[PDB]
Each structure stands twice: as C-alpha cells, then as structure tokens.
C-alpha cells in the first residue's frame, strides 16, 4: 500500500549494507591516521553501516577511538573474548565485534563451538558480531560447500534464541579468497548467500533471514565490489587489503 | 666440584636459550614454505630451543605442522584460547603457546588478568607457555616501566604454584619495539629483564629464578641479536618480523 503509479522497480528489499574493515594486518600508525583522515572527510549520503576493526597494534585502536569520528562509522573489536574481556571492551564504548576463523581454525582445526560460544557470549552483553563463515580452498574442490557452509552457521545458531539474530550479522568468506586475490565470482557469493539465507529462513525464520545482512568478504576491492553488491543475497562485504587504502571510500560507495 | 684448574671463565650459568619466530603476520604460503626448508637444511650445534608459531592464516600451521622436521624446533599456537582450545591443541600434538599483548591489550586497555588466566590455563594443561611482557612507550617515557613491568609478572605470577614456572617462559617485550625498528638497547634489555629476575628471584624463589628463561622480543634482527644475547639476563629471542627472513638462522646461531 505504498508504492507508485507502476510496478517495480526491483524485487528488494535488502536490509541496510554494511560496510565493514578489518585492520589485523598494519603497522603504519601514520598512514591509518591518514586514512581516518579520508575516512571523516568522506561524505556517505545512504544508509549504510561502516565499520572499522582496529588491532591494538602500532597505534591501531587508541588512534582510531580518539580521531575517527565520522557519524555512520562504528569500531569493532577483533575477537573477544572472555567475560573480562567483554567488560572491558562495554567499559570504553565498543559495542561490536568480528568473530571468525580465527576461532574456527587457530587451533589447529575446525573449532566451530567456540565461534558459536562466542558469537552468543558476545550477543548476551549486548554487542553487535559479525560472524564469518566460510570453506577451505580443498573443500571448495571437493564440493563440500554447503555442508561447510551449513555446519557452520548451524553451530553459530544452535546457541542462539530466535531474538538474538537482531544483533547477528554473517560474513560470509570462503579462506581461499581471503589474502589470495582469488575473489569469489558475483555467482559464487550469490550462492553461498542464497544457501545461507535459506538455511536462515527454514531453522530460524523467514522474518529474521530477510532482515539478516550477509557480507561477503575475501579479496573485495575497489574494482569488484560493485557487480558483488548487484547480487540479491550480498549485503555488504567485510574487507582486509584493500580496507587499508582510500579505495576503502569506493567499495562503501558500491553498497549503494 | 666440577671446574678445571684455573677460575672462570665466566659467573654464568644461564639456562637454556630460546630463539622463538612469531609469525602472526604474512601472507607467502610459498616462501614460508622455503622458510622452513631452510630451517631444516640448518645444523644447529648448541642447545637451544626453537620455536615457530604459525598462524591458520595461508598455508601457515598446516604447512609448518607438515613440512617442519628438525629437532630443535617445536610448533606453539598463537594465543589460545577456550578450554576446547586447548583440548583441540593437545589434539594436533601442538604443546606450546605465546601469549602477550593481544589478551592484555586487545580488549581497549591492560587486561592483565586474562593474561594470568590464560597462562595458568594453558600450564594446567600441560603447555610451555611463552608470555610476553612490556610498556608502551608512554608510559617508557614517563619513566613507568619498572612499575608496569613488576605490575604484569606479578599478575601471571598470582595464578600459578611454585612448580608451574617450569613451564613458563617470560618474553620482555616493550611495545615501542615491536615491529617499529626501535629494538632496546642491550642496556635497557638487560635492566629489564635482571628486574623481573629480581622479582621472580624474590616472590617466587632463587632455585626458579635461575632456571626461567626471559627473551628478548621487538626489533631484534641479524644485527642486533649477539649484543643483546651477551647481556647477563638475557636468555633468547621473541622474533616478529625478522623471523620470516633467511636471518631469522642468525639470530638462532647469536643464541650460542
Ligand atoms: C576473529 C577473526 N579474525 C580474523 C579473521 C579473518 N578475517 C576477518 S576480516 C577479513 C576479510 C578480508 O580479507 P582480504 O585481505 O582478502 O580483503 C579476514 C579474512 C576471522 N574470519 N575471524
Ligand atoms: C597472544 C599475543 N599475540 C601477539 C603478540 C605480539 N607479538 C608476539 S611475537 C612478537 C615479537 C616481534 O616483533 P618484531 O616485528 O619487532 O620482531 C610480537 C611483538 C603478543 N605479545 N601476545
């Protein structure tokens, strides 16, 4: 009851994108405070969540809490943690933070009930996780992908009540793109996504799977982020490389 | 009773040295691999323990756990973790971890606590424990070291028994070296670290004093390493970035 005089024009839809960096990886203090520079000197004119993953190290998260002050950026934590470490992190105003691999995988191998512990610790202090999901290169050639796919956010869900996903968000990000230039094809990302969101759906809700935001993340760049954005399921992308550069500005520009 | 005919030549002594490679931080599935044929095609005489700690990251654990042989080198895991952590470590045979900043700074702000608990942790389950220890440079400047020094040594310390320091390693490791090309000084390593001993001689007991290990980590390279290895109190290396190098063997060899 609320559209115009003619059809369409589009089948979505789509939550708001996110647009999301993760900083692991930088040990150029001066360079970031630049880059916040550009970051705060950025008009973004849609609706879109951005957020910023500063590691402790080198000037990293004291740099950013203090000089990054943009409206539509939020700063996350990486990782997190135990209960201390969700105390502390409420105590300084951090209310996100990216969960993934590293908690699947430091441990030498498929430690999905910690992700999920976490993602649910996480969820009951009140924060905002992303959590990522995503298959190796060898069970990418195999075609174990969506039984990957599905054993991991199933195991993120298991801990979770059907209201928590208000806080939940999923990346997305097969660990054969991740630091490799070996990006997943607009189709590859599509369905992934689409599996993920009909598993949502079905176990959880369909109320919560179209209002769930799915980012895709490994090796999103200024050049692919666009036609990445088109797909119907991709809500955004989680980016490492090229989140350390002012192409950062342009893939937040592709989620509009 | 067990001298030649003449003094000397030395007071020390000294336990057996560390020379640990950090590898948190690289992305060359390839040349990580070459890293460790060169490893392997090095003789190391002396007694010393080496130690490599891989990241899931690329190739990374699972290419080193594979393609890593020699006998003077053991595998540590990168932080870690939950109790299912450890439990899934113990698994993959993986007996050693590094633990530091990240645990007391990831979460906005000296988490000593997790510190200590994760140490004690880990040595309950049977783990070599690196754990590192070090200022920021402001609080360096200001002339705070001795007492954030004695601050964090002192927390590790409250949660462990008399006899679990024989798995514990200590790291002095200031954050105004890591990764900044500003290594301490063999003067200021030595001051540090005879400080902790002091400690560690004092709260916890002589006999444990001069059997713990303290190693010296930011900034150390080829060059560096032997001066700072000659110090008194200096019993090795915490290696970040020179640790992904050729030279990373030299370092090794400053140890004897
Ligand atoms: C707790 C935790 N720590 C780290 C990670 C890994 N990680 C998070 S951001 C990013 C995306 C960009 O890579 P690229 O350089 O290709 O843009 C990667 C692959 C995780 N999933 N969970
Ligand atoms: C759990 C945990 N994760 C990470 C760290 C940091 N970190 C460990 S190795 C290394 C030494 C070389 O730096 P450089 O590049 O100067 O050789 C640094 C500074 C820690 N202390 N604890």
């Not at 409206?71 to 996350?76: G, L, R, Y």
């Not at 009540?161 to 990000?173: F, G, N, P, Q, R």
């Not at 935001?213 to 955004?236: E, F, H």
């Amino acid at each position: 009851s609320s559209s115009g005089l003619v059809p369409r024009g589009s089948a979505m839809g789509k939550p708001q994108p996110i647009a999301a960096a993760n900083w692991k990886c930088n040990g150029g203090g001066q360079s970031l405070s630049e880059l916040i520079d550009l970051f705060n000197s950025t008009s973004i004119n849609h609706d879109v969540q951005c957020v910023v993953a500063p590691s402790w190290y080198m000037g990293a998260q004291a740099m950013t809490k203090e000089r990054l002050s943009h409206p539509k950026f939020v700063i996350a934590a990486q990782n997190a943690g135990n209960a201390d470490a969700l105390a502390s992190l409420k105590d300084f105003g951090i209310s996100w933070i990216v969960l993934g691999h590293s908690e699947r995988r430091a441990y030498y191998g498929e430690t999905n009930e910690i992700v999920a512990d976490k993602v649910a610790a996480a969820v009951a202090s009140g924060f905002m996780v992303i959590a990522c999901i995503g298959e190796t290169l060898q069970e990418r050639s195999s075609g174990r992908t969506a039984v990957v796919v599905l054993t991991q956010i199933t195991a993120i869900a298991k801990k979770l009540k059907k209201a928590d996903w208000a806080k939940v968000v999923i990346a997305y990000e097969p660990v054969w793109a991740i630091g490799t230039g070996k990006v997943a094809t607009p189709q590859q990302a599509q369905e992934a996504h689409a599996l993920i969101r009909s598993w949502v759906s079905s176990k959880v809700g369909a109320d919560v799977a179209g209002e769930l935001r799915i980012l895709y993340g490994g090796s999103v760049n200024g050049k692919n982020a666009r036609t990445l954005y088109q797909q119907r399921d991709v809500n955004g992308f989680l980016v490492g490389g090229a989140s350390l550069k002012p192409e950062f500005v342009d893939i937040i520009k592709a989620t509009q």
